[PDB]
Scaffold this active site. Sequence first.
Site, mmCIF file in Angstrom:
data_model
loop_
_atom_site.group_PDB
_atom_site.id
_atom_site.type_symbol
_atom_site.label_atom_id
_atom_site.label_comp_id
_atom_site.label_asym_id
_atom_site.label_seq_id
_atom_site.Cartn_x
_atom_site.Cartn_y
_atom_site.Cartn_z
ATOM 1 N N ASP A 194 1.096 -1.726 -0.174
ATOM 2 C CA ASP A 194 -0.041 -0.021 -0.400
ATOM 3 C C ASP A 194 1.062 1.337 0.403
ATOM 4 O O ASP A 194 1.753 1.432 0.991
ATOM 5 C CB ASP A 194 -0.849 -0.361 1.336
ATOM 6 C CG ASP A 194 -1.946 -1.276 1.387
ATOM 7 O OD1 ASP A 194 -1.917 -2.107 -0.128
ATOM 8 O OD2 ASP A 194 -2.928 -1.011 1.506
ATOM 9 N N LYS A 228 -6.656 3.093 -3.370
ATOM 10 C CA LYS A 228 -6.753 2.646 -1.697
ATOM 11 C C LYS A 228 -6.831 4.514 -1.555
ATOM 12 O O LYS A 228 -6.110 5.409 -2.068
ATOM 13 C CB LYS A 228 -6.163 2.699 -0.261
ATOM 14 C CG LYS A 228 -5.928 2.236 0.754
ATOM 15 C CD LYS A 228 -4.647 2.164 1.231
ATOM 16 C CE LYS A 228 -5.056 2.516 2.752
ATOM 17 N NZ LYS A 228 -3.861 1.242 3.471
ATOM 18 N N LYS A 267 -9.941 -0.390 -2.724
ATOM 19 C CA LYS A 267 -9.852 0.196 -1.445
ATOM 20 C C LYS A 267 -10.048 1.119 -0.773
ATOM 21 O O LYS A 267 -9.476 2.029 -0.576
ATOM 22 C CB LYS A 267 -8.247 -1.116 -1.038
ATOM 23 C CG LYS A 267 -7.887 -1.023 0.092
ATOM 24 C CD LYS A 267 -6.219 -1.366 0.803
ATOM 25 C CE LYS A 267 -6.874 -1.789 2.345
ATOM 26 N NZ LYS A 267 -5.439 -1.654 3.025
#
Lengths: 225, 221
Positions: A88, A150, A179
């Site tokens: 991430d 994300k 996400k």
Amino acid sequence: MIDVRKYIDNAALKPHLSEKEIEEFVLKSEELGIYAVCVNPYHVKLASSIAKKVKVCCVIGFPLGLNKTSVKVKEAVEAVRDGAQELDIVWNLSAFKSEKYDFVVEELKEIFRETPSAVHKVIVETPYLNEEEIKKAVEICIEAGADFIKTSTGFAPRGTTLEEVRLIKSSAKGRIKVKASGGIRDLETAISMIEAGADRIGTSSGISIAEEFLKRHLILEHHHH
Amino acid sequence: MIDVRKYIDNAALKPHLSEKEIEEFVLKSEELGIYAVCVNPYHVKLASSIAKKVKVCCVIGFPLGLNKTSVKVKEAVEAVRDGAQELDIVWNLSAFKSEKYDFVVEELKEIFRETPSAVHKVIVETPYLNEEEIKKAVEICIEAGADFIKTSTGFAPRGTTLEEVRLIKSSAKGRIKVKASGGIRDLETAISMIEAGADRIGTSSGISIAEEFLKRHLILE
């Protein structure tokens, strides 16, 4: 009746957490059937040693994303070498804000190519982005070749919104996964985010959410009766 | 007031700040006579390219301090090459909490040795530490040979207090300097923190504070 556990990336990113706490955090998550655990680089090796079925995710250039590209690359590379299966990565929002789009895309592409084996998720920090910037963010992540986009790092005055995930889902058109993370502390919120388009959910309350789901599934009807 | 500007480390660390804003921030700080500016690694080259008298400070392993030693080292080295004169390094709090004191000291020593030309400040994150851990924190920073022990990081549920600064100063007993940061938003607070024992003030409101100092001086005399 969504099995939220399979969507959960349980995060243990607080600096004051001891290694013991990380260990038990990973154990509980594995036990609750949570898909993955997100940790800081220092904890990657430890998490991978404990984890059996649960995926090990590591935050790169987290949470500010203002480290030099070379440093983000080294951190990404070392994360994989320590057992990271997912990354991430916080993009460079300042460069984005300065309209250095190519630099943003190239930094991501470089980090990705040096870590071909890991799932790549780019944190774009939606709470600091307006509608147009979010559409651009999506195009950047797709051009960079990311597997996921994300929404937030959690280090913002506002959590992610249903509007943000809905927009990303629409703009994506199936060429990138979403996400949702930041401000998600309960089951109802996790479920709503999934219904709005989220392919994965980031939260530090994965255990509590996983248990609430278990409770409801064990007690309330919804199967075939 | 005792010229608070000489104690100010004006921080511009929010990731949403464009490079134009960072430039304006550094320029403005320079014009107001602030001692130094504190920026993220990415902005060091830009900050140093415009800074004349203001010292350039770079945050390392900020703000969580949970990066690998190897990367913190690279980050510190890169910062110096980009023009950083001072480095505010976040120690590994997880390792600290896990009683791996030697690891914590060794990580810092290593970072310092690769950047001998820079002033070294260790951010210990006081809002996550009780009184006993603060005293141990001070002994760790001294053992590591740091120039300053810095209180917060800014990313915490609470800022630093006058009590914390007083505590750190007495425990330090002249063996290390003190930089108070976290929640310092105005001149009054900055002055009290220095009076409490702070050798430096970490704040993102340095412009406002310096301006308030100048106004008071020009209006009172």
